[PDB]
Subunit: 516 residues, 2 copies
């Protein structure tokens, strides 16, 4: 009766015969379930609207993954009120029991692992590897934060002088509004919903409208793991009607957001306003974009350099806030790293991600497709096209892995988040110049340095100003409890998810002192 | 290496040698009155023609000091000075940053009674309050130095075979410290050196009613060995300087202590991303409290009488933690009321240089005018028991004032007076007393006086304040023993003098080296 130590959920080895077979079976399972209708969930009740959000396969744009009900202001209000009501009892449920519900939820997802992955394959267009990694990460968030809450329930040791007893401990806050992204349709949605839940807060969840079906699947799991009614509420909808209304509500205590900079800034600015009837300042956790950089030193393993750039730039087709969309390389080694990377990139497979042999799938929708292609046109003018630069939206939203070279560090494609499979190469005079270019964005989320020089490693630890800094590997693929994730500048509030400080952001410290 | 933290002992003024030492310090400070005090920008002394004059609140025509006044240009110069200082201060060994705090603590400890005497003249503090303020400044320096040494170890996170992951803290940037007049030494010191020891640099705008003791503390930091520009002393008006400091695109962190109306506007303005601003501004706010001492049927009513008196009238109620409401069980309301009235009539009011005066004046004409208006409202809301008289002729003296039989929703039971005023209200039972206790828009401190163990544990859960006390006064928190901060409109619950405090001034960084 103690939980066994946290460790990360292993990735599935699809070279084992039985793992592929099992994954293909789960893909068949989901395919037959495609096209289903999903209600809103408010206070445990299923609420269907006739106005709907259609969710489409990005690899097959006329394949309906599902249609979910669409909330409006009035249902957002009911969702808030349900959350507030449930909080009156939820804040007093023993932290051990709250954690147990997360542990039971993890075991349901673990048992149904490939099914959750195949949902991501279909709805988010994730390749096998990325889908598995995502599902593993959601499992981790559950197991990690369950353990963290039990640790935090112990409180913190403070001093008491003779004749008094002083105690410091953490208390639940209230209604949390969780606004989740599509690119980690399961993992981040799970983390940013359960961190508030396990800390005794209640949640109103607005998933991304491009991926709401997997979120409905997850709320079903929460119910099956024994979560009381109204503790989570499932309300997809428009930003103008539901998004803005949830953030502005006087009963919203906490907001947790993951998405783009432009939506984030506006959310952060609106949340700070003390509205009528609002008796508190709202706590805001924002995780916005990155314009991340892989820097390669003159002593680097050049093959490793090219491999780390490739994976950082083209994993999930660059649709990650952590993506190495910039490659800044030492002058003595730039032409050669650039040729090694081009050589890897043009043999990468792009297609339907239900097919295992496809390394990259499509981008999320037509809006993103067009945005990425428009950046590529800008890029082609600003730099030297090396490979890719083509798109075809006729079946799915497919863009080739794209490398553009010789960019000026001030270029549009060196500065702006593209969220597509594009990396821009940039020449650096020496190591000092390389970090100068690396730091020259308005963001500070992830970065990598490839070097065999210890002094250069120590220098970048001080000088490379990103929240997640990696040496001799890719700058993507943070693991819960191993690489706590969040960053600086226009990347957000540096709320290190999957780290030891994360739960306490969701709670209020309390000091009690009895004088004898 | 450093000996474990304990609080600086308070001075025993019943020992004649202590009185003698304190009276000599008052003589020393009296000789130094009416001096001129420049702004300190990047180590340079800047005199302006515009002057802020600091007057003794007990003798209103006495010039304690005249300080220079910043304008926008000088505010701009100070942010730039702090920004350039940050470029190297961010990289000073945490141990050395901590050691400067220790040396500063030693300077104040050696000149303890001198600093207390500065408080007596400038803020009107009685000997006990001035001494406790000075000891708390010493405590902040000692405690935060040690907290930084510990924080510099980082926190343990997991590494899978073949990698090494680390989680540690980094300095943020320029900090705007806006400090209160009521702990013109202690809180000004805490919220200046917490950013400093964490590697940030500070633009300090002290309260314009108490800028002289802040000028004195800046000199201490210089003498202890602080590099130029790490602190900048820049008093001024809220309009020319205060808003400009907050809104500056280079300002990274804002620490505020003060009133609700000012703290709320600052919070909302800080959240907007201004032109050329590359980050979201972190804000720590501690705002007021409408605090309540709850007296149970079971209580030691002598203790209950004393606790209410001290909570209410300590520093003439000029405290965010002040027990300005007394909520008493019906069965004991008359008896506690008459006992408290009998203690209040014995309280000596006058010039705080005189040891025999337990209470001094309020801070200025504005504060005097506001409290008297609140007294006039109070007389029409309930039953005036004692005091209610004010005298402006030589200083700003208000009598210790008790008003009884209040409606729980009355103006003087809801709005912060910041004066020597207590409202008394009768509660039907313990459950009703918690209802009245929790009925303000504030959440800072409270106390429960009771001999019922069950009612104590019920209070730990249902009395929603950040600082909760049993069988004593609700004032006088001690650094490292009673971490200080609260809920609702009391602010962000950033627990000053507590284990979580320094990490709020830093951004966490994850660093990961892959080996094979």
């Amino acid at each position: 009766v103690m939980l066994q130590p946290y460790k990360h959920e292993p990735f599935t080895d699809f070279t084992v015969e039985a793992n592929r077979k099992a994954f293909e079976e789960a893909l068949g399972l989901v395919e037959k379930e495609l096209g289903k209708e999903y209600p809103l969930i408010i206070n445990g009740e299923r609420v269907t609207t006739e106005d709907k959000i259609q969710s489409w396969n990005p690899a097959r744009k006329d394949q309906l993954v599902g249609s979910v009900s669409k909330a409006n202001q009035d249902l957002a209000e009911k969702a808030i009120q349900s959350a507030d009501e449930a909080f009156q009892t939820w804040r007093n449920v023993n932290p051990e029991e709250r954690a147990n519900i997360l542990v039971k939820a993890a075991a349901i997802i673990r048992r149904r692992k490939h099914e959750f992955s195949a949902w991501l394959v279909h709805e988010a267009g994730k390749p096998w590897k990325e889908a598995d990694a995502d599902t593993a990460e959601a499992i981790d968030f559950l197991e990690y934060y369950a353990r963290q809450m039990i640790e935090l329930n112990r409180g913190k040791e403070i001093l008491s002088r003779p004749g008094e007893q002083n105690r410091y401990f953490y208390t639940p806050m209230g209604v949390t509004v969780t606004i989740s992204p599509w690119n980690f349709a399961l993992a981040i949605m799970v983390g940013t919903a359960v961190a508030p839940i396990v800390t005794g807060n209640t949640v109103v969840l607005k998933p991304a409208s491009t991926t709401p079906v997997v979120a409905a699947k997850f709320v079903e799991v929460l119910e099956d793991a024994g979560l009381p009614k109204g503790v989570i509420n499932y309300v997809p909808g428009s930003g103008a009607e539901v998004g803005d209304y949830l953030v502005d509500h006087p009963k919203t205590s906490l907001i947790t957001f993951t998405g783009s900079k432009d939506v984030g800034v506006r959310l952060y600015e609106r949340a700070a306003v003390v509205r009528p009837g609002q008796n508190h300042l709202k706590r805001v956790i924002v995780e916005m974009g990155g314009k991340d950089t892989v820097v390669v030193d003159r002593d680097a393993d050049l093959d490793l350099a090219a491999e780390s750039i490739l994976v950082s730039a083209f994993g999930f087709s660059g649709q990650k806030c952590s993506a190495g969309s910039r490659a800044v390389i030492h002058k003595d080694v730039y032409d050669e790293v650039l040729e090694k990377t081009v050589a890897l990139a043009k043999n990468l497979t792009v297609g339907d991600p239900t097919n295992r042999d496809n390394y990259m799938g499509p981008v999320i929708d037509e809006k993103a497709f067009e945005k990425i292609m428009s950046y590529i046109e800008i890029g082609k003018k600003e730099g030297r096209l090396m490979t890719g630069g083509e798109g075809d939206s006729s079946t799915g939203f497919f863009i080739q892995p794209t490398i553009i070279a010789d960019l000026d560090p001030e270029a549009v494609i060196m500065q702006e988040e593209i969220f597509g499979p594009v990396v821009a190469f940039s020449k650096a005079n020496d190591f000092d110049h390389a970090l100068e270019i690396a730091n020259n964005t308005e963001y500070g989320l992830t970065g990598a340095v490839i070097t065999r020089n210890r002094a250069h490693i120590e220098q970048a630890k001080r000088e490379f100003h990103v929240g997640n800094l990696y040496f001799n590997r890719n700058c993507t693929g943070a693991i819960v409890g191993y690489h706590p994730f969040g960053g600086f500048k226009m990347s957000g509030t540096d709320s290190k998810a999957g780290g030891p400080d994360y739960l306490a952001l969701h709670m209020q410290a309390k000091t009690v002192s009895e004088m004898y």
